[PDB]
Amino acid sequence: DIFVFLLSTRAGGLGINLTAADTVIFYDSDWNPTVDQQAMDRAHRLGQT
DNA sequence: GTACATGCACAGGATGTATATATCTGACACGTGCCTGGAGACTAGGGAGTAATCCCCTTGGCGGTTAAAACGCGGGGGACAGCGCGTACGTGCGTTTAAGCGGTGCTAGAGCTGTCTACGACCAATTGAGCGGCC
């Protein structure tokens, strides 16, 4: 059921492994990359199909 | 040397009490579990010490005037009788709370949920001191 999950890149995401997500949206971008790259891959990982 | 307050006894009713009885508070023996005595390891502030040096309390001389002690001037505080407004007994009547056994509420506990301030901590911007160039 739960359509959408709300996160922060520097706390909500950290290694949290949301394989049930199909898609990712950045409503914000950080002054450093890597945090966004991790934020994507906390969905984009080997547990998806 | 004095006689009013103390000191001993009578009169007598109540209060200190014994026998007789039923029972709930306290004693006892059990264990849970709360937590305190001991004791360990380390932190790093509190304390003690050496030390410098500054300034208050006591001290001694002195001058002032107030209380003490004495005295004069004179009345209100300690003591007897009447007036009359309260204070202490005793009863009827019953207002009042007792003491009871359930019905229900709200008060208490431990914990949760929600702060939510308020505190370090990390994270990313952006800024001043560091060293070098130029005419």
Q: List, in sequence order, the alpha helices (H) in chain A.
A: 35-41
**Nucleotide with C1' nearest the A35 CA:** B123
Strand B bases contacted by the protein (CB, 7 Å) = 123-125
Nucleotide nearest to A32 (CA to C1'): B124
Residue A13 phi, psi (nearest 5): -80, -30
Place of tokens 């002054």: A31
Q: Tokens for A21?
A: 């997500």
CA atoms A36, A40, A41, A42: torsion sign: positive
Q: How far apart are CA A21 and CA A30, in angstroms?
A: 22
Distance from CA(A20) to C1'(B62), angstroms, rounded? 106
- Protein residues bordering strand B (Cβ below 7 A): A 10, 30-32, 35
Resolution to 1 decimal place, in Å: 3.5
Method of determination used here: cryo-EM
